[PDB]
Amino acid sequence: SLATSAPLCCTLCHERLEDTHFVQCPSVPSHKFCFPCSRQSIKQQGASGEVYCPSGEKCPLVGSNVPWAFMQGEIATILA
Amino acid sequence: RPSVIT
Ligand SMILES: [Zn+2]
Ligand SMILES: [Zn+2]
Ligand SMILES: [Zn+2]
């Protein structure tokens, strides 16, 4: 077993999130967001039509040149 | 992509 992995921290609020369900930016390993911070990003970005990386840096989908966006099902899980 | 939710 394991008591805990090495510490990993929310990019925006600095809270520990290793070994939890959190949002991992596909193309930037250090971009990690807890669900509370992600909820804020979804609400603030939602009016544009798409929700991109909560860092605001429009990080790409891996292998592509366009920013990755949340899926509807992920928004549902995060807002639950 | 896989889900962004870990
Ligand atoms: Zn062990
Ligand atoms: Zn956070
Ligand atoms: Zn990112």
Side-chain angles (χ1 to χ4, degrees), chain B:
Chain B
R1 54 164 181 83
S3 180
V4 295
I5 301 182
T6 62

Side-chain angles (χ1 to χ4, degrees), chain A:
Chain A
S1 60
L2 186 57
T4 182
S5 301
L8 305 173
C9 276
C10 178
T11 294
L12 305 175
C13 77
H14 315 305
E15 188 127 35
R16 298 265 299 260
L17 43 65
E18 80 289 332
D19 316 310
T20 73
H21 299 295
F22 63 89
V23 170
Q24 173 66 61
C25 174
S27 48
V28 183
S30 64
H31 281 179
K32 308 177 192 293
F33 314 93
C34 68
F35 277 15
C37 288
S38 296
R39 288 164 190 141
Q40 298 293 355
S41 193
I42 288 160
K43 295 143 82 153
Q44 168 71 21
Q45 293 192 72
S48 74
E50 295 299 314
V51 188
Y52 299 142
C53 178
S55 63
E57 299 174 7
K58 302 182 208 203
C59 316
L61 203 59
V62 166
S64 153
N65 66 338
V66 301
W68 69 266
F70 283 87
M71 282 165 198
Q72 185 180 242
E74 294 163 328
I75 290 173
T77 298
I78 292 166
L79 300 164

